[PDB]
């Protein structure tokens, strides 16, 4: 589970990037971790 604000986005690139734009979060790591 995540804190609210993040969408679970996945690209054909084979990698997932967790986006939360309050403060523009673009990250490889799950933000709950």
């Amino acid at each position: 589970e995540l804190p609210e604000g993040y969408e679970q986005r996945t690209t054909v690139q084979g990698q997932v990037y967790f986006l939360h734009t309050q403060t523009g979060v673009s990250t490889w790591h799950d933000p709950r971790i």
Binding site: E7, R9, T11, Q13, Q15, Y17, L19, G24, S26, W28
Partner: peptide, 10 residues
């Protein structure tokens, strides 16, 4: 399904 950033190769 709404992103502003480009995807990283790192």
């Amino acid at each position: 399904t709404s992103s502003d950033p480009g995807s990283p190769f790192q």
